[PDB]
Amino acid sequence: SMSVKKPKRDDSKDLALCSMILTEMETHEDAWPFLLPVNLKLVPGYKKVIKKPMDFSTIREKLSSGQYPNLETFALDVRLVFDNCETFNEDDSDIGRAGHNMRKYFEKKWTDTFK
């Protein structure tokens, strides 16, 4: 509350650290379904079903242009990538498996870096 603050967590390396995580996600072999925006002209259903499309290149742009207010907002867009994936893909598909793999991969890097 007013003039009563929890001690100040050092957040000054978060930008860098999120960019590193994102680089590791971009360079994972199962990243391919997530590297670019899904082509909304060419994938029937995607536009209407997926309210908030997200992908790594878009996350990369937002990061790089100061569009993440903090590390939680960045984590949210990453998770959205995988939540969208699960909405549109069957678990027993290459893309659906990619999704699960990538989410596990991210969640580990997140915990080990920040928690």
Angle between helix 14-26 and 56-64 (nearest 10)? 160
Residue 51: DSSP 8-state? S
CB atoms within 10 A of CB 49: 11
Give the closest residue to 40 by CA, choosing from 32, 31, 49: 49
Give me the helices (H) in the chain, please.
14-26, 46-49, 56-64, 71-88, 94-114
Q: What is the resolution of this structure in A?
A: 2.2
CB atoms within 10 A of CB 4: 5
Give the closest residue to 25 by CA, choosing from 95, 104, 89: 104
Dihedral angle computed from the Cα positions of residues 53, 105, 111 and 17, in that order, rounded to the nearest 10 degrees: -70
> Where do the domains of the chain lie, and which CATH numbers do they carry?
1-115 (1.20.920.10)
Give the closest residue to 84 by CA, choosing from 55, 110, 108: 55
